[PDB]
Amino acid sequence: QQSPYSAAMAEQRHQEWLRFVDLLKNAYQNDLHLPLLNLMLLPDEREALGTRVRIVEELLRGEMSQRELKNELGAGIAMITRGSGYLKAAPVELRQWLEEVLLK
Amino acid sequence: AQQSPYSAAMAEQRHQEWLRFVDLLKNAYQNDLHLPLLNLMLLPDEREALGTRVRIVEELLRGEMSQRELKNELGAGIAMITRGSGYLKAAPVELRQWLEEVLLKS
């Protein structure tokens, strides 16, 4: 069970995360998101984000086989399992929107 | 061409994929879906790293925190500070100046 120490540190990390999220929100409103994201994310991390969008899209579409996900997107079985679990755990508003925007 | 066709084709596919992510997140913010989208797209440790990198950038721009404090408070050793400082130097000055206004506002 978490202690006051661990709870304090977790809340501090949460606030730091929200500060990043808000900084990026504002960057988008001032057309500075692209250079901000180049500063805050390494190239391989940006590549991972682009690929993960594809994985999510293709999991929702349901047409690509597991072998095709691996060959085309580099997503092996464990990554598909994790990604599927993230989708299942996402709030309904996010899943509905992703279906609307990624499969349109 | 700057790159051979194999490398160029893969780079342009990655670029298109990146822009798709950027646009998706742009719209998520507008729809108040940014938090769940980022929880889907980033692992917990990756989210923590982004929170910490904001603090490193802030403290590098502020100039007050020492090298030892950067390591002991923010996990940033000498090499990481050098890398981060290099990213700031490479960024457009417009971004740097905006970061100073936002992050050092107080």
Ligand SMILES: O=C(O)Cc1c[nH]c2ccccc12
């Ligand atoms: O260089 C790294 O290890 C990751 C990284 C990406 N953007 C940064 C900004 C400040 C400090 C570290 C990083």
Ligand SMILES: O=C(O)Cc1c[nH]c2ccccc12
């Ligand atoms: O599970 C991972 O290794 C990384 C990851 C985070 N969000 C994802 C969405 C889809 C596929 C993989 C990931």
